[PDB]
């Protein structure tokens, strides 16, 4: 109850009868990634600290000049 149902066309024996077409193509599609990776590329310590301190000093100087004008 299987021969022609599975494949009738031209085989001589029960082996090499069917064509399946079920799973993956030859190659495993890829090597995939699973490990985390988060790059840390922001200005780390001294850049940000100098930015804060320098902009603070310069902002204070600007406040001084402005209060001079306003007076």
């Amino acid at each position: 109850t299987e021969a022609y149902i599975r494949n009738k066309p031209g085989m001589v024996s029960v082996k090499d009868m069917p064509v399946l077409q079920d799973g993956p193509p030859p190659g495993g599609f890829a090597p995939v990634r699973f490990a985390r990776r988060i790059p840390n590329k922001g200005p780390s310590a001294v850049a940000i600290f100098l930015a804060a301190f320098g902009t603070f000093s310069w902002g204070m100087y600007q406040v001084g000049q402005g209060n001079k004008i306003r007076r």
Partner: protein, 318 residues
Amino acid sequence: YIAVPAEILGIILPLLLGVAFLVLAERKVMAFVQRRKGPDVVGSFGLLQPLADGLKLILKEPISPSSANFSLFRMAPVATFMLSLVAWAVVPFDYGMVLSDSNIGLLYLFAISSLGVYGIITAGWSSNSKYAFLGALRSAAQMVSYEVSIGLILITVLICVGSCNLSEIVMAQKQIWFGIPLFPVLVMFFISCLAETNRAPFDLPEAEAESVYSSMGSALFFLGEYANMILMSGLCTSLSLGGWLPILDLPIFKRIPGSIWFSIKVILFLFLYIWVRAAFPRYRYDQLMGLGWKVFLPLSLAWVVAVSGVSVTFPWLP
């Protein structure tokens, strides 16, 4: 004689329109953050959503409470509402475009915040159950701690410029925005404004009240909260980011009406509120009050000392 009530109406109604559209835009932008659209069916772009919600809460069958049913329960929401609005009284939207030039505006804003604390505590206790009373006490303590921090920050920005009425402050910024040099001060003031209205990371009081009552009463209460939110945003941009002043001072910016600049800054800060809401888990209560009394008070005090120091050694102090 009759001009003053006209001005008051023109201050009140647009604020209510804006706060309805504020909660609408809140839902919308948090949605967009979370990879989804917000309300987009009722209106052309969801614009008719707040109107529909208002009409629903109006036609909804009311339920009067059973706890001091007059002069103590049907008053406190009105109390916090009146306090928020009377705070909205003195805010400059442009040169002279104010309601009252109260020459001590800052003290005024600080006092009104404390009176809002009164509003919330009496609204909490006016109910019957006691867990609402414990929640009210928690919210009161949090609000008052972050108010003392806000006070010290105000003292800093005041040291930087002599007078107190807000127009003079925005001129002082017209030289150079105080947000630039005192950037950490701005960050601390913003965190304190967040904790002051319990919005983004500090919500455990409200979260617990939701974990364990009139329709119009709750509507008035949420309205007061969001109005106070817009107020805090407004004074933050009125004393730390310029207050109706174009950037880079080039005579093509000077065609913008100035009032537009204030609206742009306050809308940016509102967007920042809603953004920082939908990115962070909530603190507990213990850690909340601990940070209030350990991390922001000393930092703010140190900042007062430091700015006073730097501005008293050189002839930079008006």
